[PDB]
Each structure stands twice: as C-alpha cells, then as structure tokens.
From a paper:
The recently discovered CDGSH iron-sulfur domains (CISDs) are characterized by one or two highly conserved 17-residue CDGSH motifs with a consensus sequence of [ΦCXCXX(S/T)XXXPΦCDG(S/T/A)H], where Φ and X are a hydrophobic or any residue, respectively. The [2Fe-2S] cluster is coordinated with three cysteine residues and one histidine residue in the CDGSH motif. We synthesized genes for a type 3 CISD (PcCISD) from Pyrobaculum calidifontis, which is a hyperthermophilic archaeon, a type 4 CISD (RsCISD) from Ralstonia solanacearum, which is a soil-born plant pathogenic bacterium, and a type 6 CISD (MmCISD) from Magnetospirillum magneticum, which is an aquatic alphabacterium that utilizes iron reduction to derive energy. The four CISD structures display striking similarity in their overall appearance, with dual iron-sulfur binding modules and a β-sandwich dimerization module.
RsCISD adopts an intertwined dimeric structure with the dimer interface burying 1250 Å2 of solvent accessible area per monomer. Residues 6–66 of RsCISD are resolved in the structure and form five consecutive β-strands (β1 though β5) followed by the iron-sulfur binding module and a short α-helix, α1. Each subunit binds a [2Fe-2S] cluster via residues Cys41, Cys43, Cys52 and His56 in the CDGSH motif. The structure contains a β-sandwich packed by two intermolecular five-stranded β-sheets. Each β-sheet comprises strands β1, β2 and β5 from one subunit and strand β3′ and β4′ from the other subunit with the order β5-β2-β1-β3′-β4′ (prime denotes the other subunit). The intermolecular pairing between strand β1 and β3′ is parallel, whereas all other adjacent strand pairing is antiparallel. The β-sandwich is stabilized by a large number of hydrophobic residues (Ile7, Ala9, Tyr15, Ile17, Phe21, Ile23, Leu31, Ala38, Leu40, Pro50 and Phe51), which are highly conserved in type 4 CISDs. The two iron-sulfur binding modules are packed closer to each other in the RsCISD structure than in the mitoNEET and MmCISD structures. The interface between the two iron-sulfur binding modules is mainly polar, burying two arginine residues and four water molecules. Lys57 is located at the opening of the [2Fe-2S] cluster and is conserved as lysine or arginine in more than 90% type 4 CISDs and thus may be functionally important.
Numbering used by the authors:
A (entry chain A), B (entry chain B): 5 to 65
C-alpha cells in the first residue's frame, strides 16, 4: 500500500486496504484506489470532493 | 492495511504501507502505524499533531 499526500490536495491511497469508521462501518473501496480528504472541508467525508480548491488548502510537502 | 478515520480526529493507518510526497520523497513511518491529519490544521503535515482539538474539527462518521 502506497499513500501519497498530494500537495494542496487529498491523500491518494493505492493498493489493498480497507477503510473503516471508528464505529466499525466499512466504507467502499473502488478499484483499489481512493482519495481521502486532507483539507478538512469535504462535504463527503472521508472522501475528497474538490473542496480543497474552494478553500485554497495550502499544504506543499 | 486498515485505515480508520477517527471521529473528529486523524486517519489511523495500520499495517504494511509507505507514505510518499507527490515529489517522490519517502516519509518516516514508525512501526507500521501512523496518524495522518484529517482536519487540515496540523503544523506537522501530513502527521496529526493534535490541532484537530484546537480547531474543534467536526466530522462524526
Ligand atoms: S482534500 Fe479534497 S476535499 Fe479536502
Ligand atoms: S487530524 Fe489531528 S492535527 Fe489534523
């Protein structure tokens, strides 16, 4: 599994992994890839929905 | 690999994985486990530094 934190962007996850809530609810992994919100403002958490551009999330690693 | 998105807090990643920048730089993973900032406010991105509590991050999944 490789996690790429995109600059000014989401975490890109690729490989064989599961996403779960603290409660234990399985969230959907499609095609062994996901983009998870890193900016805090997605309206579809934990998935990135483009909100990072709206709030000009500034994080360059 | 299991990614647990903690309520009002970081992503917990457990298992065999790497973390890389979009630039290609490997980031240091301690003992098959990391907490990655979900709130957008860590001053040590991509790692959670407890800033989620300071800015009262609200995401209960
Ligand atoms: S990183 Fe894309 S919506 Fe937050
Ligand atoms: S989730 Fe803990 S610092 Fe952002």
């Amino acid at each position: 599994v490789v996690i790429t934190a995109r600059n000014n962007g989401p975490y890109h996850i690729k490989g064989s992994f599961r996403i779960v809530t603290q409660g234990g609810r399985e969230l959907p992994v499609e095609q062994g890839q996901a983009w998870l919100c890193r900016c805090g403002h997605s309206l579809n958490k934990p998935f990135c929905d483009g909100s990072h551009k709206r709030v000009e999330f500034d994080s360059n690693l």
